[PDB]
DNA sequence: TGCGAAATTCCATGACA
DNA sequence: ATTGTCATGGAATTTCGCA
DNA sequence: TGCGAAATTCCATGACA
DNA sequence: ATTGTCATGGAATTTCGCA
């Protein structure tokens, strides 16, 4: 744009370009005399080029590229040029970090009844215990009750045979697990079908989706660890005994036990509770129907100071799962189809395809 | 007297032998007293050590304050007696040629032994696999005499496996020769 | 405590026992009726073996283990007993984890001068590249200016072919660095003393105490990761473009580049700064001694609600650094010789040994 | 005019062939022509390529606005006029046969030139080791025109390596002796 | 109708790799 | 086509025992 | 002596494995 | 015998251009 700088050099006034100041020619180029000192004002033809050279020194953000230019130019809104570059500098986008929080996690209702929902998960490996590295750990929702089964592999087979031992007391009506190979498989889904369960998946790479039995894993893990103190890693037999161990303590928030969640009733373990002795089976089951719908429920904690929440529309970007050394850390953009809720989004890539994503996997692709 | 509640009472019986099914040849039954629930230990033998395998299992769920069996060898055996000892369970005995229980878990043994001879024709080698489905139907088998199946009384929840169809558990004449036929 | 007991069913009134309750005798044992129903008072003398049978069920804390023995007894002050038993269970307490948070961060001065103080460290395994596999990174301290060598091994022999490479052009004062193999080596504090350099260690298992030169870390990385897009990972022939970029960057915060603190003017790079083109270089010093003085410096953040700060004395426990699969995370408490400053102690362990240690890799023991 | 600055001239020259050490046989020789700051790199030969290898890493650090040399082959050549079109440096020669630098900058070469001589004797074939140790001599040697050192004018501080020791740099009667005995 | 202490509740911290 | 959880031990707050 | 917008400064977020 | 750091891009705040 050497016409618009022209009319500059004779005098008239441009949408921009302050009056107050000396526009003037000098070895070839249209310069200007700011506090700062005399910068030259390329012509708007040549402005990408130069932003671009600035940003690419160091693929800088805003101010680190907005204050290598202005070391040598001058022109109207030099920034909303430097963020238009910022935004379609595809290393930038993909290699950088970002700046903006999830927003603040949903606390799903407690499963109303015991057997509504399983929370499924593995251990291991683990040092290996009479030929077992795994333990496949199920968490009733409702409840908390635990049932562990030593395993040599996280596979479907393994899994179903644990679940047909367990599925011989009661059949759930939802089993959530992760994104695990021995969960996804078309075996397990119907070995489910097969059953009248269905299945339940986390968005993938969210551990905290599949919280109930995650928490559980520390407490196992923590009083296995516990009790081998001194002692070899032979973990095998104590499974039945920390099964039991933590199905039988107390939750110092709620003041019951998984074990008392499920039967209303202690069974012939140490100090086991007495209260209900004078009532009948029927009158203890009427008390244990109303401790179950009385418990304490947390709800969502307050949001950060910068959190983001999805819009659909909007382009984000899905966390590399596994990045190789040197490897940008971020997808492509992609666009948000539909927000399920805060927390959960569908959203389409650039191959085409819908995905099921938390927003902890994702950010939002930065200068719009 | 206290109210009946469940884990004060397991009454435990081998079923067997029985045809080979994944290397098992017995069952042994448990049954809690005041709900009627129905556990079910596939073993290789009516032994001691076959009892204590199969009885960690259970006691890991839940353990009861006495133990009812009949005079068998793997339950009057000391071994039986320090593990029960070792768990504060009571061992309780039937007088010997006496077996005595409650008319509610004499009702549930038969249930038992009437819907596994009903199974086992056709298929007496699958029996292993059939345990789970076995169990369920027990548990979710509605009471006359208490208006609540094994499950409600132990839960206290409906199940989602409601087992609304009734099945003869009688054998057919088909089944009845084929039964006669196995016996050769 | 049967004689304590005795007087207390007769009518007497004894210290810690309400008045207002009836205390009696029923099936051999001294009873109590309470609100929440009748409970066994136990002898003072089986007391402590009830603590540790009912904490010892799955090694619970102080609610946990308080309501399972609530659950069949009563006697005065329990949980002061419950916490005696906590304190004195070494499996809680080296497999616990801590819920007091750290102190407040300390934001040390930024060194005086440049060639104070150097922190080195090694990326790396990064994938081969002619070669290479390691990148040992310089910077100084108060200019933040980097130096990069692309190395085959974190060895003292690498880097003291690379220090001696950069050390042609200034020594420094000190060189901190992490206790890494290649910097706690005798032939590198023979190479420093040789030399006038002093060799300064970060605390064990604390890159935070190398901040200067992990920040750097990752410029490095993220500028090689963008550079490297849709591209073989050649990393070697980009560490010399990778140094001359981040060290002509400037830093928002500062409105200064690495370069213009340690040299006081731009070279010949793109976008140089022209602004004392007409000062003399004592003039252009001058300016640049005055800049270096008032730059900005951060100031220790808010404590959080529940931190902790080390007390000579103190038992403390640190934090085990490599644990094993199904061992605890802490070692067996220590005792805090010295406060070195609010964030860093000299630790006396069972072993009789001192050691310099971060509060972050420390819990203050529990329960006294 | 504008003030004379670090990085607006470079002065580059070849010193050797040097007795081999560490297969090295030449030494690059840079000194910034404002400071008087010096660079030393070994080299192979006085080619292209060991110059832009050389100098290579040292625009890693500094790029000069201009470099001066003579018409030495290595800096005449088109690859070498490509190498400083490519990182924006004027290249500046000299007049065959007529070296010219300035008044510092010469008599910072002759520095060079006798503080090397000085050091091979004894131990000719172990100049490479010593390279970082004659730059910080170099640059922290006080100029009298100046007042201040090429390590002061560079960074605007005092160094940790003050080189108060203003050694003879001239050759003792057993170093000539010695000298002399190598020149055979 | 209020005091000192014990009991209970709160809740930040951290780990489920 | 889904979603964080909860044991832990000092601190804060409430309740208890007595008057 | 004050308005609208541009420029600058602030600062939570996250990564140095 | 030592100790966190700082690029980043929206938001908050200050300054600029003009009257
Ligand atoms: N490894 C692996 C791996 C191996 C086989 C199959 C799969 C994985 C799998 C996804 C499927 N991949 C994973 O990365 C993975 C993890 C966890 C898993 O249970 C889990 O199955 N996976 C897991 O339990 N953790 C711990 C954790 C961390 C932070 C938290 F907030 C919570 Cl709640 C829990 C995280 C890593
Ligand atoms: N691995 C390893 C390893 C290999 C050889 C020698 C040594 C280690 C060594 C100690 C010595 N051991 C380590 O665990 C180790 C680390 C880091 C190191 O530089 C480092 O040298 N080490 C390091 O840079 N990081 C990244 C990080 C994480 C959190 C932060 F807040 C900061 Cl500032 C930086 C952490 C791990
Ligand atoms: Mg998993
Ligand atoms: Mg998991
Ligand atoms: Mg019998
Ligand atoms: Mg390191
Ligand atoms: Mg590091
Ligand atoms: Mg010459
Ligand atoms: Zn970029
Ligand atoms: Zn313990």
Same mark, same amino acid.
């Given at each position: 744009?050497?016409?618009?700088?022209?009319?500059?050099?004779?005098?008239?006034?441009?949408?921009?370009?302050?009056?107050?100041?000396?526009?003037?020619?000098?070895?070839?180029?249209?310069?200007?005399?700011?506090?700062?000192?005399?910068?030259?004002?390329?012509?708007?033809?040549?402005?990408?080029?130069?932003?671009?050279?600035?940003?690419?020194?160091?693929?800088?953000?805003?101010?680190?590229?907005?204050?290598?230019?202005?070391?040598?130019?001058?022109?109207?809104?030099?920034?909303?040029?430097?963020?238009?570059?910022?935004?379609?500098?595809?290393?930038?986008?993909?290699?950088?970090?970002?700046?903006?929080?999830?927003?603040?996690?949903?606390?799903?209702?407690?499963?109303?009844?015991?057997?509504?929902? $399983?929370?499924?998960?593995?251990?291991?490996?683990?040092?290996?215990?009479?030929?077992?590295?795994?333990?496949?750990?199920?968490?009733?929702?409702?409840?908390?009750?635990?049932?562990?089964?030593?395993?040599?592999?996280?596979?479907?087979?393994?899994?179903?045979?644990?679940?047909?031992?367990?599925?011989?007391?009661?059949?759930?009506?939802?089993?959530?697990?992760?994104?695990?190979?021995?969960?996804?498989?078309?075996?397990?889904?119907?070995?489910?079908?097969?059953?009248?369960?269905?299945?339940?998946?986390?968005?993938?790479?969210?551990?905290?989706?599949?919280?109930?039995?995650?928490?559980?894993?520390?407490?196992?893990?923590?009083?296995?660890?516990?009790?081998?103190?001194?002692?070899?890693?032979?973990?095998?037999?104590?499974?039945?005994?920390?099964?039991?161990?933590?199905?039988?303590?107390?939750?110092?928030?709620?003041?019951?036990?998984?074990?008392?969640?499920?039967?209303?009733?202690?069974?012939?373990?140490?100090?086991?509770?007495?209260?209900?002795?004078?009532?009948?089976?029927?009158?203890?089951?009427?008390?244990?129907?109303?401790?179950?719908?009385?418990?304490?429920?947390?709800?969502?904690?307050?949001?950060?100071?910068?959190?983001?929440?999805?819009?659909?529309?909007?382009?984000?970007?899905?966390?590399?799962?596994?990045?190789?050394?040197?490897?940008?850390?971020?997808?492509?953009?992609?666009?948000?189809?539909?927000?399920?809720?805060?927390?959960?989004?569908?959203?389409?890539?650039?191959?085409?395809?819908?995905?099921?994503?938390?927003?902890?996997?994702?950010?939002?692709?930065?200068?719009? | 007297?206290?109210?009946?509640?469940?884990?004060?009472?397991?009454?435990?019986?081998?079923?067997?032998?029985?045809?080979?099914?994944?290397?098992?040849?017995?069952?042994?039954?448990?049954?809690?007293?005041?709900?009627?629930?129905?556990?079910?230990?596939?073993?290789?033998?009516?032994?001691?050590?076959?009892?204590?395998?199969?009885?960690?299992?259970?006691?890991?769920?839940?353990?009861?304050?006495?133990?009812?069996?009949?005079?068998?060898?793997?339950?009057?055996?000391?071994?039986?007696?320090?593990?029960?000892?070792?768990?504060?369970?009571?061992?309780?005995?039937?007088?010997?040629?006496?077996?005595?229980?409650?008319?509610?878990?004499?009702?549930?043994?038969?249930?038992?032994?009437?819907?596994?001879?009903?199974?086992?024709?056709?298929?007496?080698?699958?029996?292993?696999?059939?345990?789970?489905?076995?169990?369920?139907?027990?548990?979710?088998?509605?009471?006359?005499?208490?208006?609540?199946?094994?499950?409600?009384?132990?839960?206290?929840?409906?199940?989602?496996?409601? $087992?609304?169809?009734?099945?003869?558990?009688?054998?057919?004449?088909?089944?009845?020769?084929?039964?006669?036929?196995?016996?050769?």
């Amino acid at each position: 744009l050497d016409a618009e700088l022209d009319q500059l050099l004779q005098g008239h006034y441009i949408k921009g370009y302050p009056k107050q100041y000396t526009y003037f020619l000098e070895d070839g180029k249209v310069k200007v005399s700011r506090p700062e000192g005399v910068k030259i004002i390329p012509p708007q033809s040549d402005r990408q080029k130069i932003v671009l050279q600035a940003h690419n020194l160091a693929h800088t953000g805003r101010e680190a590229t907005l204050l290598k230019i202005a070391n040598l130019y001058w022109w109207p809104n030099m920034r909303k040029d430097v963020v238009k570059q910022l935004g379609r500098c595809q290393q930038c986008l993909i290699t950088n970090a970002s700046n903006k929080a999830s927003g603040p996690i949903l606390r799903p209702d407690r499963p109303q009844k015991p057997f509504d929902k $399983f929370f499924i998960d593995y251990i291991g490996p683990l040092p290996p215990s009479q030929g077992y590295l795994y333990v496949l750990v199920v968490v009733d929702g409702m409840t908390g009750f635990t049932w562990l089964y030593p395993t040599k592999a996280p596979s479907t087979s393994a899994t179903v045979k644990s679940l047909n031992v367990l599925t011989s007391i009661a059949i759930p009506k939802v089993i959530h697990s992760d994104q695990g190979a021995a969960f996804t498989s078309s075996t397990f889904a119907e070995w489910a079908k097969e059953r009248g369960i269905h299945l339940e998946f986390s968005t993938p790479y969210h551990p905290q989706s599949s919280g109930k039995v995650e928490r559980k894993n520390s407490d196992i893990k923590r009083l296995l660890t516990k009790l081998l103190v001194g002692r070899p890693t032979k973990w095998y037999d104590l499974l039945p005994v920390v099964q039991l161990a933590l199905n039988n303590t107390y939750s110092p928030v709620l003041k019951y036990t998984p074990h008392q969640l499920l039967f209303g009733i202690d069974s012939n373990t140490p100090f086991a509770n007495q209260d209900t002795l004078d009532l009948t089976r029927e009158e203890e089951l009427s008390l244990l129907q109303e401790i179950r719908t009385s418990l304490y429920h947390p709800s969502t904690p307050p949001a950060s100071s910068r959190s983001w929440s999805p819009v659909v529309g909007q382009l984000v970007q899905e966390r590399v799962a596994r990045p190789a050394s040197l490897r940008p850390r971020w997808h492509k953009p992609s666009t948000v189809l539909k927000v399920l809720n805060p927390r959960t989004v569908v959203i389409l890539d650039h191959l085409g395809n819908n995905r099921t994503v938390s927003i902890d996997n994702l950010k939002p692709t930065s200068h719009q | 007297d206290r109210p009946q509640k469940p884990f004060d009472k397991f009454f435990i019986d081998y079923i067997g032998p029985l045809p080979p099914s994944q290397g098992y040849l017995y069952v042994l039954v448990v049954v809690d007293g005041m709900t009627g629930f129905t556990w079910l230990y596939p073993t290789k033998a009516p032994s001691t050590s076959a009892t204590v395998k199969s009885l960690n299992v259970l006691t890991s769920i839940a353990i009861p304050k006495v133990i009812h069996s009949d005079q068998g060898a793997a339950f009057t055996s000391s071994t039986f007696a320090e593990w029960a000892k070792e768990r504060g369970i009571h061992l309780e005995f039937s007088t010997p040629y006496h077996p005595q229980s409650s008319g509610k878990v004499e009702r549930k043994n038969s249930d038992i032994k009437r819907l596994l001879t009903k199974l086992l024709v056709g298929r007496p080698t699958k029996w292993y696999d059939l345990l789970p489905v076995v169990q369920l139907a027990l548990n979710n088998t509605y009471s006359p005499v208490l208006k609540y199946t094994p499950h409600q009384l132990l839960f206290g929840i409906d199940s989602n496996t409601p $087992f609304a169809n009734q099945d003869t558990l009688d054998l057919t004449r088909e089944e009845e020769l084929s039964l006669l036929q196995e016996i050769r």
